Symmetry: C2
Protein backbone atom coordinates (compact mmCIF):
# COMPACT_ATOMS: atom_id res chain seq x y z
CA UNK A 1 0.00 0.00 0.00
CA UNK A 2 0.89 3.70 -0.47
CA UNK A 3 3.43 2.89 -3.12
CA UNK A 4 4.20 2.60 -6.81
CA UNK A 5 5.07 -0.71 -8.45
CA UNK A 6 8.25 -0.90 -10.48
CA UNK A 7 10.28 -3.54 -12.22
CA UNK A 8 13.99 -2.94 -11.65
CA UNK A 9 16.60 -4.27 -14.10
CA UNK A 10 20.15 -4.19 -12.75
CA UNK A 11 23.03 -5.00 -15.11
CA UNK A 12 26.53 -6.00 -14.11
CA UNK A 13 29.62 -4.87 -16.01
CA UNK A 14 29.66 -6.00 -19.65
CA UNK A 15 32.80 -7.34 -21.31
CA UNK A 16 32.23 -5.12 -24.37
CA UNK A 17 30.69 -1.83 -23.22
CA UNK A 18 30.37 -0.48 -26.79
CA UNK A 19 28.28 -3.48 -27.86
CA UNK A 20 26.21 -3.36 -24.66
CA UNK A 21 25.51 0.35 -25.01
CA UNK A 22 24.51 0.07 -28.67
CA UNK A 23 22.21 -2.85 -28.07
CA UNK A 24 20.74 -1.41 -24.90
CA UNK A 25 19.94 2.07 -26.19
CA UNK A 26 19.27 1.33 -29.84
CA UNK A 27 17.39 -1.97 -29.56
CA UNK A 28 16.46 -2.98 -26.04
CA UNK A 29 15.10 0.25 -24.62
CA UNK A 30 12.83 0.82 -27.65
CA UNK A 31 11.48 -2.73 -27.26
CA UNK A 32 10.72 -2.15 -23.61
CA UNK A 33 9.04 1.20 -24.36
CA UNK A 34 6.47 -0.71 -26.50
CA UNK A 35 5.13 -2.65 -23.51
CA UNK A 36 1.46 -1.89 -22.91
CA UNK A 37 0.85 -0.39 -19.49
CA UNK A 38 4.36 1.00 -18.98
CA UNK A 39 3.84 4.37 -17.31
CA UNK A 40 7.37 5.66 -16.73
CA UNK A 41 10.91 4.49 -17.27
CA UNK A 42 14.11 5.80 -15.72
CA UNK A 43 17.57 4.71 -16.89
CA UNK A 44 20.49 5.18 -14.49
CA UNK A 45 24.12 4.90 -15.65
CA UNK A 46 26.21 3.56 -12.77
CA UNK A 47 29.46 5.51 -12.75
CA UNK A 48 31.10 3.98 -9.68
CA UNK A 49 30.86 3.39 -5.95
CA UNK A 50 31.88 5.82 -3.23
CA UNK A 51 35.24 3.97 -2.95
CA UNK A 52 35.96 3.15 -6.60
CA UNK A 53 34.36 0.98 -9.27
CA UNK A 54 31.00 -0.74 -9.02
CA UNK A 55 29.93 -4.32 -9.78
CA UNK A 56 26.99 -2.72 -11.58
CA UNK A 57 26.84 -0.76 -14.82
CA UNK A 58 23.23 0.20 -15.55
CA UNK A 59 19.84 0.24 -13.83
CA UNK A 60 16.41 0.64 -15.39
CA UNK A 61 13.22 1.27 -13.42
CA UNK A 62 9.91 0.58 -15.16
CA UNK A 63 6.71 1.79 -13.48
CA UNK A 64 3.30 0.08 -13.72
CA UNK A 65 -0.11 0.84 -12.23
CA UNK A 66 -0.17 -2.11 -9.82
CA UNK A 67 1.19 -5.63 -9.37
CA UNK A 68 -1.43 -7.25 -11.60
CA UNK A 69 -0.60 -4.80 -14.39
CA UNK A 70 3.11 -5.58 -14.16
CA UNK A 71 2.40 -9.33 -14.26
CA UNK A 72 0.16 -8.86 -17.31
CA UNK A 73 2.69 -6.59 -19.01
CA UNK A 74 5.47 -9.16 -18.77
CA UNK A 75 3.19 -11.70 -20.50
CA UNK A 76 2.24 -9.47 -23.47
CA UNK A 77 3.93 -10.10 -26.82
CA UNK A 78 5.87 -6.88 -26.27
CA UNK A 79 6.94 -7.88 -22.75
CA UNK A 80 8.08 -11.29 -23.95
CA UNK A 81 10.00 -9.70 -26.84
CA UNK A 82 11.82 -7.38 -24.45
CA UNK A 83 12.61 -10.25 -22.08
CA UNK A 84 13.90 -12.44 -24.88
CA UNK A 85 16.08 -9.62 -26.15
CA UNK A 86 17.63 -9.12 -22.69
CA UNK A 87 18.48 -12.79 -22.37
CA UNK A 88 20.33 -12.61 -25.71
CA UNK A 89 22.38 -9.38 -25.31
CA UNK A 90 22.84 -9.19 -21.51
CA UNK A 91 22.33 -12.74 -20.28
CA UNK A 92 23.81 -13.34 -16.85
CA UNK A 93 24.52 -9.61 -16.40
CA UNK A 94 20.83 -9.07 -15.59
CA UNK A 95 19.06 -9.24 -12.24
CA UNK A 96 15.33 -8.42 -12.15
CA UNK A 97 13.55 -7.21 -8.98
CA UNK A 98 9.99 -6.11 -8.24
CA UNK A 99 9.79 -3.10 -5.98
CA UNK A 100 7.23 -1.03 -4.14
CA UNK A 101 8.49 2.56 -4.13
CA UNK A 102 7.05 4.01 -0.96
CA UNK A 103 5.11 7.27 -0.73
CA UNK B 1 20.24 14.42 -15.36
CA UNK B 2 20.16 13.90 -11.60
CA UNK B 3 22.88 12.30 -9.52
CA UNK B 4 21.93 9.66 -7.00
CA UNK B 5 23.49 7.51 -4.39
CA UNK B 6 21.85 4.06 -4.44
CA UNK B 7 21.93 1.76 -1.40
CA UNK B 8 20.89 -1.80 -2.11
CA UNK B 9 20.39 -4.23 0.78
CA UNK B 10 20.34 -8.02 0.59
CA UNK B 11 18.01 -10.14 2.71
CA UNK B 12 18.47 -9.68 6.47
CA UNK B 13 18.24 -12.65 8.83
CA UNK B 14 15.71 -10.71 10.98
CA UNK B 15 13.38 -8.60 8.84
CA UNK B 16 11.57 -7.07 11.82
CA UNK B 17 14.84 -5.87 13.33
CA UNK B 18 16.06 -4.59 9.97
CA UNK B 19 12.80 -2.72 9.38
CA UNK B 20 12.77 -1.08 12.82
CA UNK B 21 16.34 0.06 12.52
CA UNK B 22 15.96 1.15 8.91
CA UNK B 23 12.73 3.08 9.22
CA UNK B 24 12.98 4.36 12.80
CA UNK B 25 16.70 5.20 12.93
CA UNK B 26 18.46 5.03 9.58
CA UNK B 27 16.08 6.81 7.24
CA UNK B 28 15.68 9.75 9.63
CA UNK B 29 19.47 10.09 9.94
CA UNK B 30 19.77 10.10 6.17
CA UNK B 31 17.07 12.73 5.70
CA UNK B 32 19.21 15.17 7.73
CA UNK B 33 22.08 15.09 5.23
CA UNK B 34 22.77 18.57 3.84
CA UNK B 35 22.19 18.80 0.10
CA UNK B 36 19.78 15.85 -0.11
CA UNK B 37 17.11 16.76 -2.66
CA UNK B 38 14.86 13.71 -2.63
CA UNK B 39 14.93 10.25 -1.15
CA UNK B 40 12.96 7.26 -2.35
CA UNK B 41 12.70 3.98 -0.43
CA UNK B 42 11.76 0.84 -2.35
CA UNK B 43 10.73 -2.39 -0.67
CA UNK B 44 11.90 -5.32 -2.82
CA UNK B 45 8.98 -7.71 -2.70
CA UNK B 46 10.35 -10.36 -5.05
CA UNK B 47 11.65 -11.13 -8.51
CA UNK B 48 9.45 -11.96 -11.48
CA UNK B 49 9.80 -15.63 -10.48
CA UNK B 50 9.57 -15.49 -6.71
CA UNK B 51 12.04 -14.49 -4.04
CA UNK B 52 14.74 -11.89 -4.55
CA UNK B 53 18.30 -11.82 -3.22
CA UNK B 54 17.49 -8.19 -2.41
CA UNK B 55 15.25 -6.69 0.25
CA UNK B 56 15.41 -2.89 0.12
CA UNK B 57 16.74 -0.08 -2.04
CA UNK B 58 17.17 3.58 -1.22
CA UNK B 59 17.80 6.30 -3.80
CA UNK B 60 19.23 9.57 -2.55
CA UNK B 61 19.20 12.43 -5.02
CA UNK B 62 21.72 15.30 -5.26
CA UNK B 63 22.00 18.19 -7.68
CA UNK B 64 25.42 17.22 -8.97
CA UNK B 65 28.39 14.95 -8.29
CA UNK B 66 30.34 17.53 -6.32
CA UNK B 67 27.38 18.07 -3.98
CA UNK B 68 27.05 14.32 -3.39
CA UNK B 69 30.75 14.01 -2.59
CA UNK B 70 30.50 16.92 -0.14
CA UNK B 71 27.31 15.52 1.41
CA UNK B 72 28.85 12.11 2.12
CA UNK B 73 31.62 13.87 4.09
CA UNK B 74 29.38 16.06 6.27
CA UNK B 75 28.86 15.08 9.89
CA UNK B 76 25.36 13.91 8.92
CA UNK B 77 26.62 11.94 5.94
CA UNK B 78 29.28 10.24 8.01
CA UNK B 79 26.78 9.37 10.76
CA UNK B 80 24.37 7.87 8.21
CA UNK B 81 27.17 5.83 6.61
CA UNK B 82 28.38 4.53 9.94
CA UNK B 83 24.82 3.60 10.96
CA UNK B 84 24.27 1.63 7.74
CA UNK B 85 27.58 -0.16 8.20
CA UNK B 86 26.78 -1.07 11.79
CA UNK B 87 23.33 -2.58 11.29
CA UNK B 88 23.60 -3.90 7.74
CA UNK B 89 27.10 -3.54 6.34
CA UNK B 90 27.31 -7.17 5.20
CA UNK B 91 24.09 -6.65 3.22
CA UNK B 92 24.94 -3.34 1.57
CA UNK B 93 26.02 -2.30 -1.92
CA UNK B 94 26.50 1.42 -2.63
CA UNK B 95 26.40 2.78 -6.19
CA UNK B 96 26.64 6.26 -7.66
CA UNK B 97 24.36 6.82 -10.62
CA UNK B 98 23.32 9.38 -13.24
CA UNK B 99 19.58 9.12 -13.85
CA UNK B 100 18.78 10.23 -17.39
CL1 LIG C 1 16.06 -2.70 -18.96
Amino acid sequence: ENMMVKLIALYEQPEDKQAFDEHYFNTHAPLTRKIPGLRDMKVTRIVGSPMGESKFYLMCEMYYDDHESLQQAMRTDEGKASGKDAMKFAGKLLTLMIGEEMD
